[PDB]
JSON list of C-alpha atoms in Angstrom, two decimals:
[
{"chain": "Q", "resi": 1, "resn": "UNK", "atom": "CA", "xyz": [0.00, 0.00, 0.00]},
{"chain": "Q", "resi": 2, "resn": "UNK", "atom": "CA", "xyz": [1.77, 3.26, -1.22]},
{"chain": "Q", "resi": 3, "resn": "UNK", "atom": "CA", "xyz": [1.07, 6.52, -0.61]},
{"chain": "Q", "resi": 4, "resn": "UNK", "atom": "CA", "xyz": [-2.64, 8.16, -2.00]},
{"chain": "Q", "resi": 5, "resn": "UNK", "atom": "CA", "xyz": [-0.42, 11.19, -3.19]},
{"chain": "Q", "resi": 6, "resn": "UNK", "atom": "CA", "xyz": [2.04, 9.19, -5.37]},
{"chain": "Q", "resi": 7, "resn": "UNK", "atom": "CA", "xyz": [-0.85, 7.44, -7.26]},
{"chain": "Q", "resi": 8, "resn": "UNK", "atom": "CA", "xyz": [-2.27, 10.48, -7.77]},
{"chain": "Q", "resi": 9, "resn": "UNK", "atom": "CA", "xyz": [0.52, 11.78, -9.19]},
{"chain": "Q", "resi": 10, "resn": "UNK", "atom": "CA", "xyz": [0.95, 8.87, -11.04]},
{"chain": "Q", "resi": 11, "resn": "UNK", "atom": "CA", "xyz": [-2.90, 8.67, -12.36]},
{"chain": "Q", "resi": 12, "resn": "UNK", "atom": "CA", "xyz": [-2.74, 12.32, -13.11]},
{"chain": "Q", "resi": 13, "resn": "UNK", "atom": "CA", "xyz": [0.60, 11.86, -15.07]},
{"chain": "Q", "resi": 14, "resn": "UNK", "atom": "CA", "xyz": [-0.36, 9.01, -17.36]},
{"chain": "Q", "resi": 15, "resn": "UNK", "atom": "CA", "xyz": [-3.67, 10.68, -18.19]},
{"chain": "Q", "resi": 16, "resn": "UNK", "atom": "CA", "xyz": [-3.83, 12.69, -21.68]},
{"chain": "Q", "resi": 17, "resn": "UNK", "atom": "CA", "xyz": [-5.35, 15.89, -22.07]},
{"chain": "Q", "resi": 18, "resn": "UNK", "atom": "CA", "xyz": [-9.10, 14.58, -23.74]},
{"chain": "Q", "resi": 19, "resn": "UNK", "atom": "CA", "xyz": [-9.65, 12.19, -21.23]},
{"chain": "Q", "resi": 20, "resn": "UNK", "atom": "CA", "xyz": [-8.38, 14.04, -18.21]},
{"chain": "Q", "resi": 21, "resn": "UNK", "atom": "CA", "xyz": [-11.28, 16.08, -16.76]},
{"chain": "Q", "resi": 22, "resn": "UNK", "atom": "CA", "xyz": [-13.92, 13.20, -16.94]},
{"chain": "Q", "resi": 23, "resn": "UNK", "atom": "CA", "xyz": [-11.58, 11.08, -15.16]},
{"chain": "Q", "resi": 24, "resn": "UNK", "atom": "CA", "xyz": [-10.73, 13.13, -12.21]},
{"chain": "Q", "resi": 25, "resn": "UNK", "atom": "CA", "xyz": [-13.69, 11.67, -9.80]},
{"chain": "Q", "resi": 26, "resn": "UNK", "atom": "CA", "xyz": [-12.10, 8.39, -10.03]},
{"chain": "Q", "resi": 27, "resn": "UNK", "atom": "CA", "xyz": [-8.61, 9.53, -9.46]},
{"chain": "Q", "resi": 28, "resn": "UNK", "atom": "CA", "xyz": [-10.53, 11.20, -6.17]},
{"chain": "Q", "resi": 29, "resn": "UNK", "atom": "CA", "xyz": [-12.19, 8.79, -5.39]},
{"chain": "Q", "resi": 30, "resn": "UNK", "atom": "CA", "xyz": [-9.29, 5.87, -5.61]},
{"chain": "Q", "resi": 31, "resn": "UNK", "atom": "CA", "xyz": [-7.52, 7.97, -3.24]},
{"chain": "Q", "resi": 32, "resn": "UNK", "atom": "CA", "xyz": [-9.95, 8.95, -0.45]},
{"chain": "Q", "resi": 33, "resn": "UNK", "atom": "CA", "xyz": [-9.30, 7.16, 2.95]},
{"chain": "Q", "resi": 34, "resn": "UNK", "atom": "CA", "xyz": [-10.88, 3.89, 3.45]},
{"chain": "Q", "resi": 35, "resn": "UNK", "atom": "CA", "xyz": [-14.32, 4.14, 5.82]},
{"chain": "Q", "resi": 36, "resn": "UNK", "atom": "CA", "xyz": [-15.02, 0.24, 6.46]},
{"chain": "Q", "resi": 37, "resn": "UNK", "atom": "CA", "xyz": [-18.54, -0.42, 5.82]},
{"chain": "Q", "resi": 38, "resn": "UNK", "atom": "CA", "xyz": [-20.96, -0.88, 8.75]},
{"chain": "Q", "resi": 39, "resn": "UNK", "atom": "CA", "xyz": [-21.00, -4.90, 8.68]},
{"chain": "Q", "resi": 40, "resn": "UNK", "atom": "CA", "xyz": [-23.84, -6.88, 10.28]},
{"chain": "Q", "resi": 41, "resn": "UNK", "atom": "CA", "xyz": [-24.54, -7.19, 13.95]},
{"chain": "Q", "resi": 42, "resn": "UNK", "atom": "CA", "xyz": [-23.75, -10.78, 15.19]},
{"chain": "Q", "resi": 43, "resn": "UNK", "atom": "CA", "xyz": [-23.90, -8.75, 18.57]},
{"chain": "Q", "resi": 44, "resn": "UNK", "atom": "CA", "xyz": [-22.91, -9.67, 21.74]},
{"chain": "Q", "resi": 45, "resn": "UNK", "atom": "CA", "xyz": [-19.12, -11.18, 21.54]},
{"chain": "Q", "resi": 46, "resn": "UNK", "atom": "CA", "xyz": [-17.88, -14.34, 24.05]},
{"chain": "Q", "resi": 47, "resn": "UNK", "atom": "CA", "xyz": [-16.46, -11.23, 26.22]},
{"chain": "Q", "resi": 48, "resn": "UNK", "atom": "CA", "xyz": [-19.41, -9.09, 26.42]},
{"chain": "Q", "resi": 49, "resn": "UNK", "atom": "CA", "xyz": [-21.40, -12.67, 27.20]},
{"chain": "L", "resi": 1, "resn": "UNK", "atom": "CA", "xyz": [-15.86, 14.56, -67.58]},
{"chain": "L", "resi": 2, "resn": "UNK", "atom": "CA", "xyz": [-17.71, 15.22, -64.59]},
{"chain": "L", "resi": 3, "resn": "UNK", "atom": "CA", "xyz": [-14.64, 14.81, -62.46]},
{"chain": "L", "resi": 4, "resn": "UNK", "atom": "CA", "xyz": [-12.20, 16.47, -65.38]},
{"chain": "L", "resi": 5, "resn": "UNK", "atom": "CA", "xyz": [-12.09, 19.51, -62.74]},
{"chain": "L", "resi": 6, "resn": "UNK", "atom": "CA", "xyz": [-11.13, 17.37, -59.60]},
{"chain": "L", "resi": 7, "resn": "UNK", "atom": "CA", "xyz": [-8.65, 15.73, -61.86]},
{"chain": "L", "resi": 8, "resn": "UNK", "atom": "CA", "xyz": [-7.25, 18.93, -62.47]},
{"chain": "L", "resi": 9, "resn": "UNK", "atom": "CA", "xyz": [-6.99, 20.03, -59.35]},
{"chain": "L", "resi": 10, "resn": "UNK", "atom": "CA", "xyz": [-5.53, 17.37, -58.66]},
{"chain": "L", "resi": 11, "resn": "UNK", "atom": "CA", "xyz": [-2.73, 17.31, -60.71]},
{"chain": "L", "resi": 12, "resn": "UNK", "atom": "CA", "xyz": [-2.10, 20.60, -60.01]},
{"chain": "L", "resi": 13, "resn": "UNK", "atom": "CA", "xyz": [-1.92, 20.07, -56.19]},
{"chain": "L", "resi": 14, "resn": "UNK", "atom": "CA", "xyz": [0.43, 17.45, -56.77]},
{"chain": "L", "resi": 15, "resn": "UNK", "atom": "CA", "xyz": [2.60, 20.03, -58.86]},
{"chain": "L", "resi": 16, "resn": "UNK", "atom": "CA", "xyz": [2.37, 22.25, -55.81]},
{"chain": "L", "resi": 17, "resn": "UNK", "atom": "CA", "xyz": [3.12, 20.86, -53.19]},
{"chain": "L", "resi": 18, "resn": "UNK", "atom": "CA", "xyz": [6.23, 19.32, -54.84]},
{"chain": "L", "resi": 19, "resn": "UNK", "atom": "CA", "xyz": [7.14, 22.74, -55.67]},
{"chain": "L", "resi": 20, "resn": "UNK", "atom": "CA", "xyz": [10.59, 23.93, -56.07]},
{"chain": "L", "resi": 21, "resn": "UNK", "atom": "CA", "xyz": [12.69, 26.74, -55.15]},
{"chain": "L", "resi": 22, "resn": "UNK", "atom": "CA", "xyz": [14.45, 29.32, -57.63]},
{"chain": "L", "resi": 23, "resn": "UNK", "atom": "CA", "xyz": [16.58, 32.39, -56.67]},
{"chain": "L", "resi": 24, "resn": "UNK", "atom": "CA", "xyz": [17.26, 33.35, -60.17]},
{"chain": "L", "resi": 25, "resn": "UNK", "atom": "CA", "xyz": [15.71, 31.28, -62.16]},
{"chain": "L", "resi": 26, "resn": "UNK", "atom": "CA", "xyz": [18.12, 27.88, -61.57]},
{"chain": "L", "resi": 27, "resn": "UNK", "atom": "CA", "xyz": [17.05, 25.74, -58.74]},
{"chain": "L", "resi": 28, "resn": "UNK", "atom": "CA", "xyz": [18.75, 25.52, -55.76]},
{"chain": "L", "resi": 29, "resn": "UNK", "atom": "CA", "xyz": [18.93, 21.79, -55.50]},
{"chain": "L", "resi": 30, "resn": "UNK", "atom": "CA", "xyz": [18.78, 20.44, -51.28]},
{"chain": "L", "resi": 31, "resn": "UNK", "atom": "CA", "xyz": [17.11, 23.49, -49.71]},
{"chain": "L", "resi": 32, "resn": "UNK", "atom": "CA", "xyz": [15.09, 23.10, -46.46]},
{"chain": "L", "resi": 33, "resn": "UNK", "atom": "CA", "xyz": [12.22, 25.53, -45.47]},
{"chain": "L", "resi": 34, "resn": "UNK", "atom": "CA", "xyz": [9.82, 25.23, -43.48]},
{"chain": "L", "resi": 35, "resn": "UNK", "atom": "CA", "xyz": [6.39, 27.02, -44.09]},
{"chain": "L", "resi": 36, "resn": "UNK", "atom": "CA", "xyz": [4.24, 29.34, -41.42]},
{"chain": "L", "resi": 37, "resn": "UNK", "atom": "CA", "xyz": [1.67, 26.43, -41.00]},
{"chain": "L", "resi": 38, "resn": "UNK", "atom": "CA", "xyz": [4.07, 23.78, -40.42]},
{"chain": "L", "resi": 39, "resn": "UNK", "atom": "CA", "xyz": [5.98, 25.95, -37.57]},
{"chain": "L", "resi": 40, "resn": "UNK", "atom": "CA", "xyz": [2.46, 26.75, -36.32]},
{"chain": "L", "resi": 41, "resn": "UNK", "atom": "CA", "xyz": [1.32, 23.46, -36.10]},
{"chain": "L", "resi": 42, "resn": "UNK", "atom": "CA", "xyz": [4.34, 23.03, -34.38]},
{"chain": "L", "resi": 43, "resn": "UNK", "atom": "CA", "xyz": [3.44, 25.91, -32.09]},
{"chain": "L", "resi": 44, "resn": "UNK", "atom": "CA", "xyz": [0.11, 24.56, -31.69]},
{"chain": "L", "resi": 45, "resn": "UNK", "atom": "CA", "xyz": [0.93, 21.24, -30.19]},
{"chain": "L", "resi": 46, "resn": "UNK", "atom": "CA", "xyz": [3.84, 22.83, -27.80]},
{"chain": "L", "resi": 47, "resn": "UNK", "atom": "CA", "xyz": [1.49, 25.04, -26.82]},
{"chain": "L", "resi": 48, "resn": "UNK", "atom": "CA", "xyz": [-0.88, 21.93, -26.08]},
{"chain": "L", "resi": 49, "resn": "UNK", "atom": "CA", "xyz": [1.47, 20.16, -23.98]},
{"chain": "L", "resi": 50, "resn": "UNK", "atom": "CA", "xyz": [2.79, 23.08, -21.84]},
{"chain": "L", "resi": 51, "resn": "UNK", "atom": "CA", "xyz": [-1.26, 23.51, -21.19]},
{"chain": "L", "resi": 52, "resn": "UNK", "atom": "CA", "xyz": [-2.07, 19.87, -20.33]}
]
């Protein structure tokens, strides 16, 4: 797992000039943080038990 | 005969843009110029790339 801000350079860099506006929500979007989804419950763990 | 004027054309197209340079009237043979649109084309597409 590199940096976000080298593949952004990177996916900014080896984009050409026609394509390059359309594909800047992906380039955001590919290097936003990661927020883990919100999983199912299976509540109530062998500790909290 | 309905093309005889795009045949014309042409063959006069291909006359000039194989065209030849003179100072006096004798050519001089292996001379290199390049023409307004060809240096700004060339301008174009730098000025393309320093934009992009």
């Amino acid at each position: 797992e590199g940096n976000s801000v080298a593949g952004i350079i990177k996916s900014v860099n080896e984009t050409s000039g026609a394509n390059l506006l359309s594909s800047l929500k992906t380039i955001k979007a590919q290097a936003a943080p990661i927020y883990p989804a919100a999983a199912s419950s299976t509540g109530y763990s062998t500790q909290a038990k | 005969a309905k093309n005889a004027s795009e045949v014309s054309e042409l063959l006069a197209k291909s006359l000039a843009e194989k065209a030849v340079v003179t100072e006096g009237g004798k050519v001089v043979e292996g001379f290199s110029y390049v023409s307004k649109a060809v240096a700004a084309k060339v301008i174009a597409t730098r000025r393309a790339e320093v934009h992009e």
